[PDB]
Design a protein around this ligand. Structure first.
Ligand SMILES: Nc1ncnc2c1ncn2[C@H]1C[C@H](O)[C@@H](COP(=O)(O)OP(=O)(O)OP(=O)(O)O)O1
Length: 309
């Protein structure tokens, strides 16, 4: 063929139909401008929020946060919870690991007192209780800690967990689209993950990069999240942030990094300057600066969201 102009129109149609038959996000161009939804649960890391393209987690979708032991998964999830609550939303936690430490959760901004916690007796029950809560249309965000831990009733008394997820997720997936409840599934390191991989609209890969140090010992860790699946925005985008031991995700920390990576914060050797005055000498001070000077911190957050979306 020798075509050229009529191609960008035929393709356009193709896409358009693919879009309508299988839903928005069925095909995209990695370079495409992300759609901008109304509601979205911020993750608490401006970087991860943009890597997600929509500023936060989508609603009414199943999210999957997988990765190895102590990567930041539960942290990231607990944050998405602390934000859903901040907006006056109610959350639930389906515990099948019995490892949730509220003291920490509270420090992140979680209204632990109002947190609906469940601890099922079988993997089926877990999803059932999940579904039932979901359908009430009262929940905003539901976190199910560990897919690996939802053992079927049978085993508790041959690919059972696989079938279990499949069915469970088939049913649950519809109720979510109609309730606007986003559900997060934590995954270790794949059992029933085989299907979750497909039902999931967003799939994040969290891994621990470096053990953040500063003179003394490791006061935190540098986490790297990679969205390997994103049906709401072009996928394959990654982000890095710091989780300080006991503190969680350093918000300001992202403000700085994301700040300089957008020309909003100058770096003149150890010094972090922001449109005139100085923030501090050394990322930590800069960090500390923003944490006690919330006002400006918010200013920087606002300006990056104004510069991208
Ligand atoms: N109660 C706590 N107090 C202080 N730091 C904590 C606490 N819980 C977790 N962390 C810190 C230490 C770890 O480096 C980091 C782990 O994040 P986390 O979200 O708990 O990872 P994860 O959920 O992927 O792994 P895990 O399998 O251990 O549950 O957070």
């Amino acid at each position: 063929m020798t075509q050229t102009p009529d191609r960008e129109k035929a393709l356009e149609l193709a896409v358009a139909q693919i879009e309508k038959s299988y839903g928005k996000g069925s095909v995209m161009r990695l370079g495409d401008e992300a759609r901008q939804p109304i509601s979205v649960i911020p993750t608490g890391s401006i970087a991860l929020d943009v890597a997600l393209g929509i500023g936060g987690l989508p609603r009414g979708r199943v999210i999957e946060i997988y990765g190895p032991e102590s990567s930041g998964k539960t942290t990231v999830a607990l944050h998405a919870v602390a934000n859903a609550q901040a907006a006056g939303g109610v959350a639930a936690f389906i515990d099948a690991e019995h490892a949730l430490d509220p003291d920490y959760a509270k420090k992140l901004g979680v209204d632990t007192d109002s947190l609906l916690v469940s601890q099922p007796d079988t993997g089926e029950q877990a999803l059932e209780i999940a579904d039932m809560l979901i359908r009430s249309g009262a929940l905003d965000i539901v976190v199910i800690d560990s897919v690996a831990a939802l053992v079927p009733r049978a085993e508790l008394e041959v690919g059972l967990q696989a079938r279990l997820m499949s069915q469970a997720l088939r049913k649950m997936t519809g109720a979510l689209n109609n309730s606007g409840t986003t559900a997060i599934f934590i995954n270790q390191l794949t059992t029933g993950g085989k299907a979750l991989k497909f039902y999931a609209s967003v799939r994040m890969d969290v891994r621990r990069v470096e053990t953040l140090k500063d003179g003394t010992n490791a006061v935190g860790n540098r986490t790297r999240v990679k969205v390997v699946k994103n049906k709401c925005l072009a996928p394959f985008k990654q982000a890095e942030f710091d989780i300080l031991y006991g503190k969680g995700i350093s918000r300001e920390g992202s403000l700085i990094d994301m700040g300089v990576d957008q020309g909003l914060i100058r770096k003149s050797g150890a010094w972090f300057t922001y449109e005139g005055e100085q923030l501090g000498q050394g990322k930590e001070n800069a960090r500390n600066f923003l944490v006690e000077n919330a006002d400006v911190a918010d200013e920087i957050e606002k300006k990056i969201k104004e510069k991208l979306g």
